[PDB]
Amino acid sequence: TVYPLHARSTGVAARQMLTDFDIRNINKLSKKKDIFDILSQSLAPSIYGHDHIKKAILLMLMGGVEKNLENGSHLRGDINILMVGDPSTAKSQLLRFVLNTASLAIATTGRGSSGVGLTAAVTTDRETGERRLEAGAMVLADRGVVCIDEFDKMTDVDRVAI
């Protein structure tokens, strides 16, 4: 049997189907106008303030409305948000949600976590004596939200992949 990667949603790991209790909890939540604000407390475990940033996080977690235009490019409906602040405290705290908690967030330091290559690289190996591709983790990722900390530590050739 071949049950491949979960096609419609993100990869196989999430499995966030719902039960009647879960559907009822989600409905009881969503129909309430106020919940959008408590999400800020849901994304402010250690730092406080900048709840607008919490809104941004939950939005970019939603996914967007990236639409496939006929006979043309699928328009980008997803969003990528840059953050900059105290490299000591701002980065660690705001990161530690998307890193540890949310989902499918490959930690990316820039130069280092590029590994072999963030984008790709043609590699002709002695093992089979043949050339394949090295797809970076982000491009290996499908539908996720990749976190790139320490962005200013990019190698020069990286600056174009973005």
Added chain:
Amino acid sequence: LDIPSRDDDEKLAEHVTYVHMHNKQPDLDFTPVEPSKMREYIAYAKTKRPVMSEAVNDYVVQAYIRLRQDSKREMDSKFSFGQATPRTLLGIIRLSQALAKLRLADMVDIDDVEEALRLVRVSKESLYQETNKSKEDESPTTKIFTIIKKMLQETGKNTLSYENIVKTVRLRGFTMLQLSNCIQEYSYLNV
């Protein structure tokens, strides 16, 4: 250079959002072609190899000359595209040939190469102002004056007996009362 205007950010944005509404930018009057059969027709055109028409040459040539001379008096000037080259001429010819391909015709049209010139010049002056003016519309007596000026280029006399002047005015159609009025004005204007 994206001049930040208002009607652009209105229409462009509206129509992008309309794309989100209706996934076809084509409005009521439009014939969008799917890229597949578009490609088909395009390649078919590419398999034609039209011929350069003999008449347009002079015009083409003259165009080049113009596109040359101005360039010199525009070298250090604002639009610093320096010294348009024979490659520009050749590119114009190639553009005309491709438009004739779009005609699927083996003879390039004067309108064809004129459109090519329009393309090459619209690339220019798209930097700033993008406007011009006109003054010579009225000419109810200034036209008489310019005719007189050509006559002066011939000889250059401020005579007191006008017989070829009145003849050329009558040929021009302008009446003799307006002519005499203008003569009054310019004699008073001391010419």
